[model samples]
Target chain A: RVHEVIIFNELGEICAAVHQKPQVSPCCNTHCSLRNVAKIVEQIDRAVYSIDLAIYTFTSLFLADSIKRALQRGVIIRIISDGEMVYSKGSQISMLAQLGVPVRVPITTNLMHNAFCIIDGFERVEEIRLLRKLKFMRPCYSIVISGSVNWTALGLGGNWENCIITADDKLTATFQAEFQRMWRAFAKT
Target chain B: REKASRVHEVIIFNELGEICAAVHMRNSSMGPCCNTHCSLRNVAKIVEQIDRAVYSIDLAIYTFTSLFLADSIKRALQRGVIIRIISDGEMVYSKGSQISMLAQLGVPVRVPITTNLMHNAFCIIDGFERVEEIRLLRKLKFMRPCYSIVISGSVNWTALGLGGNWENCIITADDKLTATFQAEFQRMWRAFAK
Candidate 1:
């Protein structure tokens, strides 16, 4: 349960909610540096076979390191990302592309606003901002954590947000289909 | 109704026979688009079920200003269904939010902290017997297991989300699914706690 829908920020770890005031924990004297990165990296470390990532933005060294590490471990990785963010300063999708990983980009102008990842059907990571609210853990059951936490500076700490993590059978299967749709849309095949 | 005509493909979770799905796409070859018709009808049916027995509704959406949705909520309230809601702060305070009406009736409508926004949209119906009753009465003649109903997807309770934009929704009565959504709603409900 520790890994299930755990919320973290400059305010420390608390549950999800709507607040009148934005507050932070005393322990977080500074900003929460991609608070969930460690948890995400931990999942990547355990990936034995495959990783499917569909993200809106990709500019994190922490995430890049994890993906690269997984690649070195012979884990298959595929990425579907926003065309606009691909050229953003410090973008890391190119880094993964250089590592022989297949990356797809949408042709239409609509933002591929989904921020999610599936780690070999064992776990997943979903970043939900205020409007795109939509994670997961272990091989036991399907788990998810979704709310208002993006993998960016402001999303992780600067704003007040909420996320939920659960392990449900129906939910996982639904997400996987959506992931595949996006993957197929961008894939050359 | 009408032999459960395949009006739309169960857009998600093809493996699960218990759940159902629908979508509205403005520009796609995905034949037989319901154009929000299926989703609206389904939501109305679920709302009517709330009036049948003791139940609870917890919903969170980024933008919710539809009259049909508002009326269903009103009916549920009249039926004494426990209701809690969380909406996007800016949208709720916007010019046309029906949420204000719910607030007037003391429905405990809430928004995120001032600086942040609430983007997730979901509906969870707990302890609803209609779900099992309907499933059993129609297709699965055997005793279907009882579980909470959870509704989620990209659809907002607005015209644009329902018809204009391409949106999809997933509804299920899986236990773990409802528990997760219900638990998350509890966390949000607590923050709205005075």
Candidate 2:
């Protein structure tokens, strides 16, 4: 599908561990059904080249593990998070940074309340453009995952959230540009 | 171009003061504009959609403050379009909240009677009816039949939420998806009815 909506309330089941030990439980298992954590992880798994995340209040270890696996597979990853939220309890920002993922926090006092991931779209745009210029009509793999779903346990399964996933090139490119600008603006963090 | 799925549209809101600035730097075809109201472009789109609503407008927004949106809703109500709203109980007291204004306008506004926040930002427009009159008019005009549309994403209907924050919203007239949200809206409508 080119575009899809993931509505948490329609997913029919809540993850039992979300209330108790959301940070510790392995997400995407049968027990996790409040908001389709597996769908998000699967999107991360589809990234063959890169993933650029602009998120606030990240704490889901299952999502962290998915990106970690992508890193192990040689996928480039960078994160831009809120300055204050990195210190919040159960936040995985520091953990992901310690694991060698390039992470930046906004220097401004205003909250960086963005929750979007650019998969296979940031670093490969020029190549894809060149291929299309050569009249190659193959489908592009660039995808954008955005919505109100923060990378937190409550955000993933406990809250009534919605996430929009799309394979539209223009939208992906716009987000990629935004990510690049933030990565440069928040370079010191 | 002839695909039925082309009815879906995506919008991205960059940080305040950056959207038009970046576009200007690129010298793209978006044209030059003053910064006074540059941020309201995306908000204007939402207002436009609200103005076009023919039958009903059901909103489930977490934070509601934008006067422009509230005015649009008032105009829709004035036009004889049915409108109902659901917002987070806590945020209803927040500064600049238009929930009370909307309620004072005789619109049925409900809040979830729960501790957990109803963190949804979506609107269902013309969801319950396939108006034969509108359909026939569209066919006579050689236009596609009107379909129920759903608007959802990270937007909160506030000034900053629509313009300042790095937000996104998807507008689609997909029947199945619209019905899914319509069902949830009705469920919440009943559950929160007090």
Candidate 3:
């Protein structure tokens, strides 16, 4: 039942919560705008198993802290980012790697410009075959958060962006399979 | 009958846009990946939606350079469908932009007057009313009406955006979602109507 589309605009207001009154001003304060940043953090907090993030940019301290918290809670986290952006100022990829989160980057001039995440999703296709022997059963609570929005302050709060969160099993599997492929092809920096 | 609400589909395109697959390059020392194979072939999905527009199309995009999409919009316009576009002012002048060409062809193209970017990529298609009219006129009880659609996501209408980069496009056939995007398009359309 976790299917929703959230739109973010810097010039307008957004209903942060489902039943609460929406903020009546621009989303200049990224933390206060609960729909975009807070929503992403909420997804991270809900992760019970793993989070596979593939993004072009990773400079948001707020989002980085959420990932750190998830790691502390014993959730497996892996990140695949752009090589050029990994060394950019204010990047948290290096810091996250220091915290034992496996990170990989593509060594190519053509940008690895994907901004999406799979939460609590299976990493390998073979995992499905061993489902009966595993503790978790079919229909696990897996979801994908993807769109134009990067995990940056400007992308989340200052730009007109769209993000779709869905629990559709087929769609999640597609993303999960792609992440696994990229994880193998990319190099750990 | 067409489903009424929250019918969603997600499309993920890889570097070649020929579905997401592991493409290992032959040479490790090669300069950069080949940009020549990039084409409008992957955008057939968006073109299909654009061709289905029988009433109106409201598009707000940041980078739009694909001539294929422009041709689709042109064909829709020739069918007497109303079309309007809102693109980033800076990107409208970027290399290979089709905004000027679209404007020359009588499509109402607008750019926001702002220093920041208008970085929203979405197209709202409205044909439900016309479909209802046709259904009632022909007295076709089995004819299902076409529902409004909102196509939005990380995918930009460019050769690389659709074919080169790792991108995702979400297509939703929800009236409320279409109306929400329609309202935003109108707001920007009016704001840039100078």
Candidate 4:
């Protein structure tokens, strides 16, 4: 339960709701930062063999390190993110090979289904849209459904806020199915 | 015998106006027979059937104050459930009223017009049982609130929409203190003496 839980603002953490597009290689954008220390902690804490993750535009160094740790620990992590997240994430995704994190990217000609999380089978990946009204472990804002939102550098909200739950069934399965579709391109990569 | 179908509600959907009809509920072959704010005692039965009931009660009299429960009702609406309220809407301004606060929530809410108040104070649960609650009669501590009689169970709501109010104590439908008031409420809703 502890590992599955996500925390933020600690550094190296992926800001789920905020986004910024970088006009560079791998499109260094605002969505992800593998070097972010938070991702490492999250991955280390939450990885349980199979991690089904889907970020719209994941690009953070710390996120890579975290995924790397999950691999070394024998965690089979699946990913279904936007095209830019895969191409831009660069070394972090590559590091998956070195560390042995079984990472799969979603291949899509159209928009990638980048929403929700599917942790284990029973847990869900939800994004809290209105916090002051709808509260959880903490507060949340904004929500997503379209896969296109995560593929770009646009923040889901101002700074990225979601009710990222690691233990809800309906939401997790919903997100996992989408992850599987994205993983269909697992062979080419 | 001839109720109007064109009841308009006024609630805060995001700091704006959200209108709805008074008796608009989706009932089908796979759904329920009646919607909430139902016909008097029928409402009591529905209240008794709240598997996940959330009630909101404030200082109410027989005019138009029962709308405090709208927020609770909306959630039930999503789940395809029904709610029943026993407010008299007219008591809002009796003594430093909070009717306007409810108005802000956007309910097709109304209060019975008259000075002869509906001062009965009891709450029914799952519409079958009852609880004798008097938070409405107690002095309010808006800064702190009486902290009972929450605005729950298919009632009106404010802009945020989730129906829990600031300060009020709650009594489940099992308190023995609920007898007379409950019976009186049942009787009043049926009287139509107008």
Candidate 5:
């Protein structure tokens, strides 16, 4: 059954592949995501050095608009999309461009669908498989990597997915390296 | 008259799927030519073709091309495919120019949507994928086809009515339809295009 469960597994235990939060899309009449994606955008906007992301969709106009509004505030925004997604509107890279945001595409032979975002002189969301394809957005979570996995929309005063992890420099740097390996540098075949 | 209504042989398989299937689906694939990802349950080749392409490709056509294909074309151009269109002008302009709206993005294109004669969606592919779209109707070993494409939209840039509107309804049994679309493109290309 698709019940809300956070089943954990016993592995070499290091916090990798963080599946932070996944809330029910409250996008009925308000266009609001159960999670405050806008606040995430706001946090990204406050960055002085740089803000980076690699995603599949950015069409949640609110998020793209927030990014655009950030660019106006002079945030160094950089983004990279997987492949043809660069051409999609709600596509991560193209929408970034529509905002006049500078982005570079990484050539890769591996399939990528991971979301990584860093903010406020620190990395916030990293290696998290946040967005899932939902031609049907039924309330359910498919946790692939870990057993102690639970994904739920942040509801009433509480959300389901997981807790917002404030990653320190060490974890942030590790995530940053992975981001760079794809964003700026890749071994050409 | 430049206008296209199909994506012909985007991937020419002079062979068979049984042989092709053994190679593994080693690639990124998307669509119903409309931006929808193919689920594991739905097994189709066009989805595979859609997965391998870089954006902004010029297509071949004949008869009715639908909105579904047009949407994919638009998405591709958004990714930066340099489109070169050579189509028939014998019919009304509203026939099929499905993904042509992509021309507005300044993707270099050429069309013959003129009023004089009819055209054909037939031509070549020179970028990432090696195969091209052309005619298969009036089969000739090799000849500079006339009804095909000559100086296909000879101009070097965007022309008027390039990204035409999308309107049409065509349904074939299963997806052997894309194959039919591909056949027309090949035949038309040989007769009207260069």
Candidate 6:
């Protein structure tokens, strides 16, 4: 019977994964994840140096607004997104690009299917939703969060997704390295 | 159309659950691709760690069609690891999805309402152990790390994901991150299981 208690809902570990079910509402009603996204926006609201984001599909402007606030705070923001998504009806990639956000697409082909962000080389957001609220890590520490979650109102509230945020120097270095490559690879187009 | 998904076969690992040196591979020579230090490499690194999971393995992927990954997961279950799984409700019905097999094993499975396409892929591996020198560490009674590892990416569990499609995956061992995913899965499992 002790082992029988090991059900999915009974899983009691402190890690980062979230799901949306009809009966069970999300932990947060805010456009951002009250349990997760809000914390990430807090980071963007106060990033000291730079915010580099690469996403696959983007359909939320609440995230755009947060980045805008970050830009106003003098955070150097650069973004790369899937080329196809830029043309989607509600995708904010184009609007953000017009707002002088310096967004990049994958050379008219290919998908920039990365849902990661680097903030000031000090913090990173992986797998969690857009603005996948990059979790906290020290300047030299690498924190990574990744999983199926995307950054969209429906995605945050309507779909079932999971992600992880980790802080390790090795992971951070690797994330930064890849971020730079995409930043350059899509630099021309 | 230029909107075709590009496949990326990110990384491979040896039997001991360590990363192998072989880089990403392409499915065909028809399209342009990059193999040098791609983010997909990290996905393999994360999977390698999952191959080492001791306590639990939770997978919530939209298209779990990769044979390689399915083999790893089945092996873990055979080793008595606790596992929970979720997939796109429709994809579970897809002809190619391996989700059916996971369900067949009597593992807890859920199919979330697909308001939007379930496009994300992630795994949570709890009770992670630091394995640099396994035997010696155990003999010394070293404090087991019990790392909470989470791997998330845009890649699917299919041949299309392994190559001929652009994919990215990240693996991290962070408790804070895993907790959120855990909560989310439970929320879905609670509803779907009912």
What are the candidates' individual DockQ scores? Answer: 0.16, 0.37, 0.34, 0.02, 0.01, 0.26
- Candidate 2: misplaced stretches above 4 Å? A10-35, A122-140, A149-157, B1-8, B16-37, B128-145, B155-157, B160-163, B174-177
Q: Candidate 3 residues B1-194, lDDT tens each?
A: 53733446665556545322223233343422243223343466667788887767888888888876788889998987778888877888998888888888888888867656676788888735434544577787754335588887664634435446666666777666676677767667877843
- Over the stretch B67-182, how does candidate 5's per-residue lDDT look in tens digits? 45455445655654445444434332454544345445554333333342222222222221212222233343442311211111111001111122111111111122233333
Q: Which digits, one per residue and each the tens of the lDDT, describe model 4 over residues B1-194?
A: 11222111111111011112222332232232242222322233323333354333222223233343444455554553323343444545554343455455432233434433332223343232221222233443322211111111111121122222111111333222233234434444443222
Per-residue alpha-carbon lDDT of candidate 2 for residues B90-192, written as tens digits (9 for 90 to 100): 8888998888899988989888666566678888888744244334645754433445877877645345354465566777776776887787788778778
Per-model i-RMS: 5.0, 2.8, 2.5, 21.0, 24.0, 6.3
Off by over 4 Å in 6: A1-37, A122-149, A152-157, A162-169, A187-189, B1-47, B105-108, B113-120, B126-148, B155-161, B164-166
Candidate 1 ranges beyond 4 A from true positions: A1-3, A8-37, A59-61, A83-91, A121-155, A158-173, A187-189, B1-54, B127-147, B152-177
Proportion of native contacts present in model 2: 0.46
Q: Tell me how far the alpha carbon of residue B165 in candidate 3 is from the true structure, in angstroms, after superposition.
A: 2.3
RMSD of each: 11.3, 6.6, 7.2, 19.7, 21.8, 11.8
For candidate 6, the docking band is acceptable
* Candidate 1 lDDT over residue span A1-189, tens digit each: 423443332243332332101233234322242444455566667666567776666776667887888888777688877677765787788778887988887775554444555655443333221123432222333333333324322244333333333334444555555667666656431
Evaluated at residue A188, the lDDT of candidate 4 is 37
Worst 10 residues of 3 chain A by lDDT: A14-23
Interface RMSD of 6: 6.3
- C-alpha lDDT score of every prediction, in listed order: 0.54, 0.70, 0.69, 0.34, 0.34, 0.54
Residue B135, candidate 3: alpha-carbon lDDT: 58
Give per-residue CA lDDT, model 4, range A1-189, as digits (tens): 221212111121234334311222332332343322233344334644355655545554445555556566655566554444555633355555445444455343333323433433322223211322444423211111211222122221222121223332333344455355445544334
lDDT of 5 by residue, A53-165 (tens): 54433444545655666677655566654454556644445656766776655454332333444442233122221232223322221111100011111122121111122
Please give the lDDT score for candidate 5: 0.34
Better model by DockQ, 2 or 3? 2
**Per-prediction TM-score:** 0.60, 0.77, 0.77, 0.32, 0.30, 0.64
Per DockQ, the best of the predicted structures is 2
Query: What is the fnat of model 5 with respect to the true interface contacts?
Result: 0.00
For candidate 5, chain B by itself scores a TM value of 0.35
